[PDB]
């Protein structure tokens, strides 16, 4: 089964991208974190698609779904920490700006839930 996945930003986006988003980060680092969320990604929907604790994580994954998440591919920041190696916290986060600003995803919340959606 093909899944989605988020596509590595380009030098020319990089350069692009307003050089305080840019700040500590590298344009490898970036794409390292890219690496990690696609694999995020890519964990979930083996488990959508798959016929135990990877099964109450099945549930959650149901439960996060919204008239807004429709059939979209997404994650939460939960995910990162349960299938990556990165941490979900304040560079991942800085790092999320500069991939809803080269809309690569996009930040969808409701029922008191922040969800990120492939762009």
């Known amino acids: 089964m093909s899944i989605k996945e988020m596509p590595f930003i ?8 307003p050089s305080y988003m840019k700040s500590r980060l590298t344009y490898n680092q970036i794409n390292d974190v890219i690496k990690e969320i696609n694999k995020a990604v890519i964990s ?24 807004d998440t429709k059939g979209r591919y997404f994650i939460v920041e ?8 990165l941490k979900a ?3 991942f986060h800085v790092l999320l700006n500069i991939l809803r600003h080269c809309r690569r995803l996009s930040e969808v919340r409701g029922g008191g ?4 959606v492939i762009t």
């Open 10 to 17: 380009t030098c020319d986006e990089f350069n692009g991208v």
């Open 44 to 67: 979930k929907y083996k488990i959508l698609h798959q016929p135990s604790v990877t099964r109450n994580l099945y549930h959650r994954f149901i439960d996060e779904e919204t008239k």
């Open 89 to 91: 916290d304040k560079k």
């Open 78 to 85: 939960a995910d990162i920490k349960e299938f990556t190696t």
């Open 113 to 116: 839930l922040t969800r990120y």
